[PDB]
Structures are given as structure tokens and as C-alpha cells.
């Protein structure tokens, strides 16, 4: 049920992540900018992970077939945006953002 | 492993260079020295410098030395600065922190060099140009006999 957050899924859904996770991503990046110590940024990282996996679950629940082929082909061509355009438009037609 | 053999062959080649009877063999081992040095540089990730070593050292200087040797006579002839780390890497390899911020847009050894070779340190570049011009001028005046 829950998609595996690998390169194909993450890069395929990056377009939606960049429009629905800007608060958490910006907060985490600001925290990392001040201090790069991993033990002092675990609170923001968990928030980012929880905000991203919810989006990944929602996408799979809404358009399962329009996303499975897209992520499979992204894995096939190694995250090549130019070679994956027809299916990208198909997947972005169901999800407007 | 790869470092050890690629260094041993270069040491033997250099030893043969400095202790060769026929200068042709000396130049041939002098080529192998840079052939091994290029691989050693490639082990460091400096792909551009290894290719330039192939292009310049054994592409221009070695050819010039070979020309001079052949057609002319072929006549006969540690703990202070950086203490080494002992082999404790079973746990150290796991302790490898990767910062993805520096990988999102990564430069190559070529464009990293060219970003500052021509703008922030251009005077040294022009001084090397002048050195090349001096070499060009001095090649003629020493060796030139027309008609």
C-alpha cells in the first residue's frame, strides 16, 4: 500500500512535493544552515518525513495506475524528465498540482 | 592493491630511466612513468589532469625527446603532520556522513578549474603565456640554419 520512497517515486513526485511541503522543507533547510550537527536536527527531519510520506500515500491512493507506470518508467530511464513526457502529462492531468 | 602496483611499476620505470644504457629505452620507460602517473591521478578523481598528462607529457615532451634521441645519434650512454590511520574501517566505513547539499549541482574538475583560472588568477595565466612565447622565440635563435 505505502509506496517505497526510492529514487523513482521521489523524483516522480518531486513536482507535487515542491508545492505541498515548502514549509517543512524550508524549516529543515534553515535548521541545517545554522548548525550541521545531525543530532540537533532530528525534530525537523521527522516532520519533513511525515509530511512527505503522507503526500506519497495520498498520490498512490488517488491515481494508482497513472502513477505506477510513471514511477516505473522513471526507474526505467533513470529519472530522465525529457524522455518521460506523455506519461508525465497523464499523471499530472489527474493531480492538478 | 591498485595503488601499490601502479606505484611499483612507476618506480621500476623511473629506476630504468636513470640507469639505462640505450637512451631509446630510457625514453620508452620515461613514457611509462607518466603512463602510470596518469592512472595514479585518475585514482584521485582528477580526470582532467590525467588526460592532460597523457596529452602534454607523453604527447608532446616525450615525442620531442624521442625525436631528439632517434634521428640525431642514437649514441650509447609522517607522524608529525598527518598521523596515518591504522586499518580500523569496519566501523569507520559505517561512520560515513554524506551531505546531499553539495551533490545537487556538482562541478567537474574541468569547469571548477576554468571558473577561476581566467578571471581571478589571470595574471599568472598571462605569465605562462609569456613563458611560452619566450620558448617559441628561443627555439629559433638557437636552432635555425636556412638555405
Amino acid at each position: 500500500g505505502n509506496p517505497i520512497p526510492t529514487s523513482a517515486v521521489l523524483t516522480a513526485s518531486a513536482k507535487h512535493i515542491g508545492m505541498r511541503c515548502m514549509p517543512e522543507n524550508v524549516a529543515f533547510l534553515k535548521c541545517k544552515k545554522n548548525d550541521p550537527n545531525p543530532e540537533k536536527c532530528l525534530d525537523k527531519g521527522r516532520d519533513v518525513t511525515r509530511c512527505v510520506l503522507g503526500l506519497l500515500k495520498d498520490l498512490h491512493q488517488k491515481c494508482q495506475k497513472e502513477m505506477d507506470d510513471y514511477v516505473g518508467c522513471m526507474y526505467y530511464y533513470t529519472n530522465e524528465f525529457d524522455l518521460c513526457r506523455k506519461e508525465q502529462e497523464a499523471f499530472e492531468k489527474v493531480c492538478p498540482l | 592493491m591498485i595503488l601499490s602496483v601502479l606505484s611499483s611499476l612507476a618506480l621500476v620505470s623511473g629506476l630504468m630511466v636513470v640507469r639505462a644504457k640505450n637512451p631509446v629505452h630510457s625514453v620508452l620507460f620515461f613514457i611509462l612513468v607518466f603512463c602510470d602517473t596518469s592512472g595514479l591521478l585518475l585514482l584521485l578523481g582528477l580526470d582532467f589532469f590525467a588526460m592532460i598528462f597523457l596529452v602534454v607529457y607523453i604527447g608532446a615532451i616525450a615525442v620531442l625527446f624521442l625525436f631528439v634521441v632517434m634521428m640525431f645519434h642514437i649514441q650509447i650512454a609522517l607522524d608529525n603532520e598527518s598521523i596515518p590511520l591504522l586499518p580500523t574501517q569496519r566501523n569507520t566505513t559505517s561512520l560515513r556522513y554524506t551531505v546531499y547539499a553539495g551533490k545537487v549541482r556538482s562541478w567537474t574538475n574541468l569547469e571548477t578549474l576554468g571558473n577561476l583560472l581566467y578571471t581571478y588568477y589571470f595574471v599568472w595565466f598571462l605569465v605562462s603565456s609569456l613563458i611560452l612565447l619566450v620558448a617559441m622565440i628561443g627555439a629559433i635563435v638557437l636552432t635555425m640554419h636556412r638555405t
Binding site: - | 581566467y118 578571471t119 598571462l126 603565456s129 609569456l130 612565447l133 617559441m136
Partner: protein, 92 residues
């Protein structure tokens, strides 16, 4: 990022082996000074070509300053080449 040279090394080894096989197929059954001047010119212009390679790739970052630095470099080597020309070192 440097993982693409191992195929080249294995290619070199296999080309070595196949060349040795090809050689083993029939086993089973004075001085001229211009030759030095041409090498000198080649060395100089090979260094010049070497110095072009960072410039051509990184010509988008540097702009109107690196271009003119390269132009001054080329002007100096062009004066050198003109001296090479009129002195008759390019003739045979």
C-alpha cells in the same frame, strides 16, 4: 563519478589479448633541424589547446573578463606565431 574508466581498462586488457592472439595466428600452423622546430611548435600549440579546454566549458560563468583574458593569451601566442612565420620556420 570515476567509475567509467574500469570499462576502458578492461577494454585495454582485452584488446591486448586479442592483439596477442592475432600475432599468434601465424605461429600455430643524417639529422634535420626542422623536425625539431615542428615538435616545438606542436608543444606550444598543444599547451594552448590544453588551456582552451577549461575556457570553452566554463565560458558561461566567466563573461567578458575571462573571454578577454583568453584573447590576450591568444594575442601573445599569435605574435609568437607571426615571429615563427616570418622567420621561415614554417617552410620546408
Amino acid at each position: 563519478m570515476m567509475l567509467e574508466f574500469a570499462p576502458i581498462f578492461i577494454y585495454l586488457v582485452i584488446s591486448l589479448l586479442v592483439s596477442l592472439i592475432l600475432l599468434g595466428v601465424p605461429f600455430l600452423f643524417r639529422f634535420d633541424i626542422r623536425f625539431y622546430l615542428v615538435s616545438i611548435l606542436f608543444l606550444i600549440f598543444d599547451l594552448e589547446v590544453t588551456f582552451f579546454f577549461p575556457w570553452a566549458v566554463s565560458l558561461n560563468k566567466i563573461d567578458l573578463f575571462g573571454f578577454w583574458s583568453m584573447m590576450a593569451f591568444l594575442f601573445i601566442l599569435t605574435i609568437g606565431f607571426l615571429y615563427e612565420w616570418k622567420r621561415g620556420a614554417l617552410d620546408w
